[PDB]
Amino acid sequence: YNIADSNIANLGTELEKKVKLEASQHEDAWKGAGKQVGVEIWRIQQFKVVPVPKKHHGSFYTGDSYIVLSTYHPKTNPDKLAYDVHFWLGAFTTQDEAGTAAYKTVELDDYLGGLPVQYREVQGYESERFLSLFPGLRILDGGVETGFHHVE
Amino acid sequence: TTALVCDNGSGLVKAGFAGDDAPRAVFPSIVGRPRHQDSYVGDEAQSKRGILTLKYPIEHGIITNWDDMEKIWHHTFYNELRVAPEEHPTLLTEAALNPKANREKMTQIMFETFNVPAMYVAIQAVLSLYASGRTTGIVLDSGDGVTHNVPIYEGYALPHAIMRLDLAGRDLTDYLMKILTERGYSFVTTAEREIVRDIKEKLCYVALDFENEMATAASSSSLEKSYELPDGQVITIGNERFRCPETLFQPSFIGMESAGIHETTYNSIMKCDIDIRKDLYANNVLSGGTTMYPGIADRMQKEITALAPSTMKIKIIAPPERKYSVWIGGSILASLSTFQQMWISKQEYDEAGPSIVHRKCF
Ligand SMILES: Nc1ncnc2c1ncn2[C@@H]1O[C@H](COP(=O)(O)OP(=O)(O)NP(=O)(O)O)[C@@H](O)[C@H]1O
Ligand SMILES: [Ca+2]
Ligand SMILES: [Ca+2]
Ligand SMILES: [Mg+2]
């Protein structure tokens, strides 16, 4: 099996990038994101990307999944912005929440031109980078209900 | 408006509704016709298996009988899910490296025959990776027709490193049929093959050390299992339990010269840029029914450890519901309005024809 004349011949193209960039324009959560240095946080709630109020940033429900965008000035230019995007997966989050957080992390990456570096942060396995965002990580019991309907 | 998600496997249809945690319809991808030389689909063909010869419209993940595939899809919509397809956007799936005409004809039939309002064709292994809650990893997807390796980084498959083998569950069933008949148990008809597939699913496993397990099986009966046939006769199977899926690691068992699944996985990682191999080695995600053998994750961990640098963290992820991971990933993505935004509409198909599938579905 070769790539030519196959369903993967258009992967990795400018066309793929254009299509996914356009799709990311249809998510209200990203409007105005990544415009200044700091940390922005959303939680997945029944497949939706819901902003977390600033006053609660750093507290995470163990039952839920989150997207954390860290905007910073890179070493290369003090007046430009660079990005780490962390998705945090609670020990008790459900499969719909973790999968939506993963897909929407890629989408936010697309929205910001591919510039964000992605980090998968499972509860209890958080990277030093993630820990460093809260110089104050607090884990809460509970979380919002799954968006899945359970097939009996 | 609820989207339909249909994962058309070579062996099993998995179909249902976006937003559900599992497919509501799972049934053999078969059309049956009288064994004495007009047709039945799926479970009703399986029900009349005594008088029917069973044909699979998909071989090695590619639709080879379009008339019968239309019967499968019609059955899925009207007889199993009991929906009107013109009322439902529909997500279909494909193995990577299929010829482009396969999804072109999928698109044509969905719009022109079933009049769906919108549709998308997704890469199966990408769906499985999202179902596992990851954007980076290497999926080993192994079903009834195709085994393939798809490395993915930050949500994008690496097409130059994708590997594919025509060795999968159907070949393992056939090999079990062959080696059981060599024990004295005749299984030959497409009907008896069904019994053998059930034996394979119930009793086979991957040995951690194949040579040692062969010696154990020849010394005592400690590895033997009984199996009751439909007529009530009880047969005993022994080293066939683990010789059958050993073929995945030693394709020469069925006369193939190709690499085993540990080697194709390693080779795929090795086709990726050096610095991301680390993340792939730590995120080998198993998907599909043929990855369900007890012992397969431990065996992959052992074999990949032997091939990889000694300092490399290796991890095999084996989700318990991985018979349905592809479908579940489809259910999640089809629940997202931004993913739906990329689907082909009927109006777009009317303007552009089948070629539009390559411009919209990635
Ligand atoms: N517990 C099990 N152990 C081993 N094999 C199994 C088990 N359960 C199912 N299988 C095999 O898995 C295959 C079906 O898996 P499935 O993932 O639904 O394939 P598919 O999607 O229909 N085919 P493909 O077109 O290759 O993706 C058949 O060969 C089954 O016999
Ligand atoms: Ca939750
Ligand atoms: Ca990026
Ligand atoms: Mg499959």
Residue numbers in the entry:
A (entry chain B): 7 to 141, 144 to 160
B (entry chain A): 5 to 41, 51 to 375
The publication says:
Actin is one of the most abundant proteins in eukaryotic cells and plays essential roles in various cellular activities, including locomotion, division, and transcription control. The dynamic assembly of actin is controlled by the hydrolysis of ATP, bound to the center of the molecule. Upon polymerization, actin undergoes a conformational change from the monomeric G-form to the fibrous F-form, which is associated with the flipping of the side chain of His161 toward ATP. Here, we report the crystal structures of the three mutant actins bound to AMPPNP or ADP-Pi determined at a resolution of 1.35–1.55 Å, which are stabilized in the F-form conformation with the aid of the fragmin F1 domain.
In P109A, the absence of the bulky proline ring allowed His161 to be positioned near the Pro-rich loop, with a minor influence on ATPase activity. In P109A AMPPNP, polar interactions in the active site were essentially similar to those in sWT_AMPPNP, and His161 was flipped (χ1 = 67° cf. χ1 = 61° for sWT AMPPNP). In contrast, the χ2 angle of His161 in P109A AMPPNP was −72°. In addition to the Nδ1–W2 bond, Nε2 of His161 was hydrogen-bonded with a water molecule (W* in Figure 6B) that replaced the proline ring. The less favorable His161 ring conformation is likely stabilized by the Nε2–W* bond as W* is in a position off the ideal ring plane. The ∼20° less rotation of the His161 imidazole ring resulted in subtle shifts in the two key water molecules. W1 is slightly further away from the PG of AMPPNP, from 3.2 Å in sWT_AMPPNP to 3.6 Å. In addition, the distance between W1 and W2 is slightly longer, from 2.4 Å to 2.7 Å, likely explaining the increment of the W1 occupancy from 0.68 to 0.89. The optimization shifted the distances of O3G–W2 and W1–W2 from 3.7 Å to 4.1 Å and from 2.4 Å to 2.7 Å, respectively. These geometries in the hydrolysis-ready structure were comparable to those of P109A_AMPPNP, suggesting that the proton transfer process through W1–W2-O3G properly proceeds in P109A. In summary, although the efficiency cannot be determined, P109A is expected to have ATP hydrolysis activity, which is supported by the P109A_ADP-Pi structure in the following section.
